[PDB]
Design a protein around this ligand. Structure first.
Ligand SMILES: Nc1ncnc2c1ncn2[C@@H]1O[C@H](COP(=O)(O)OP(=O)(O)O)[C@@H](O)[C@H]1O
Length: 312
């Protein structure tokens, strides 16, 4: 449904050097330098991003969605469904355009034979759109995401000539994801800290880490809400940062010199000085969270890789 353009720069996507290049070569260059991809170099029709969950598929998708030079981006997902015909339409009308279908593994059921009457109808609607009588020769590419690609139907799988794997982040990659998600928020983690976190999250996916930071990140909020005492520290003016004040209030332990008796209720709106997210927090946040992506994922996944190679 969403017909937007996001703001996820390659920089934000950590790791995935090759995915990045592979996607530049098949999506961005053909757009910028059309004369280069004519004749025998017509870019592939559909790319299929696949691999363990939370490794970057959807995310990376938005990356190309931003790096698409005004080349309108269309995104749909698992959700009278002739609206498929309708999607490709506005797409051809606005070429060059991209189509991203998250978790394409939706329309299928190649395990326990999950079968529906008209879902067999929904598939073929699009399964036909791939060629089109009125050739969509246009600069239109179809992106497909999936964490369970083997359950895919050869019918669709084989309309994606170029397929890309999206792996579990390596060390350096993790570290950056910690710094990235932390964003520009007040904290106190040193480089050596990120690297140490990177080393600790061995085997975690990118979504796992994001789930971690989003938690630790909320640590200074809890401390402020659940506090019982507040010191009276000195720090930047809430209304004008470059003007220190010796007036701000910050939550602190009852057993601390300068500890006033009162909760956030009393703390004025513009005198609150929040704590900085710390390494002790991220670690506590890391502990109560364990990697989900087990070897089966890569196991039944390694299969698809070998037994299907390209041409799907
Ligand atoms: N390689 C990555 N770089 C930065 N963030 C990532 C990466 N992979 C996953 N994430 C995080 O997880 C989310 C995207 O998950 P995707 O949508 O990548 O999961 P799927 O890959 O869809 O399971 C984003 O919100 C992002 O914060």
């Amino acid at each position: 449904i969403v017909i937007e353009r996001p703001n996820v720069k390659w920089s934000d996507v950590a790791g995935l050097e090759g995915a990045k290049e592979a996607l530049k070569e098949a999506v961005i260059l053909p757009i910028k330098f059309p004369h280069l991809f004519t004749g025998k170099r017509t870019p592939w029709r559909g790319i299929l991003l696949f691999g363990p969950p939370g490794t970057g598929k959807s995310y990376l998708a938005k990356a190309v969605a931003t790096e698409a030079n005004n080349s309108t981006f269309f995104s749909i997902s698992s959700s009278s469904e002739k609206l498929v015909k309708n999607l490709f339409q506005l797409a051809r009308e606005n070429k060059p355009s991209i189509i991203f279908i998250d978790e394409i593994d939706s329309l299928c059921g190649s395990r326990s034979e999950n079968e529906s009457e008209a879902a067999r109808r929904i598939k073929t609607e699009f399964l036909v759109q791939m060629q089109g009588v009125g050739v969509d020769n246009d600069g239109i590419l179809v992106l497909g995401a999936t964490n369970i690609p083997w359950v895919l139907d050869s019918a669709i799988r084989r309309r994606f000539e170029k397929r890309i794997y999206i792996p579990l982040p390596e060390a350096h990659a993790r570290a950056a994801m910690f710094r990235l998600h932390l964003g520009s928020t007040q904290n106190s983690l040193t480089e050596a800290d990120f690297q140490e976190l990177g080393r600790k999250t061995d085997g975690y996916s990118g979504a796992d880490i994001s789930i971690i930071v989003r938690d630790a990140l909320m640590q200074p909020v809890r401390k402020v809400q659940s506090a019982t005492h507040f010191k009276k520290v000195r720090g930047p003016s809430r209304a004008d940062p470059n003007c220190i004040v010796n007036d701000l209030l910050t939550p602190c332990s009852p057993g601390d010199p300068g500890a006033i008796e009162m909760t956030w209720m009393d703390v004025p709106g513009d005198k609150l000085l929040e704590p900085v997210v710390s390494m002790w927090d991220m670690l506590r946040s890391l502990s109560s969270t364990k990697p989900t992506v087990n070897e089966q994922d890569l196991l039944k996944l390694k299969k698809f890789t070998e037994d299907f190679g390209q041409e799907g």
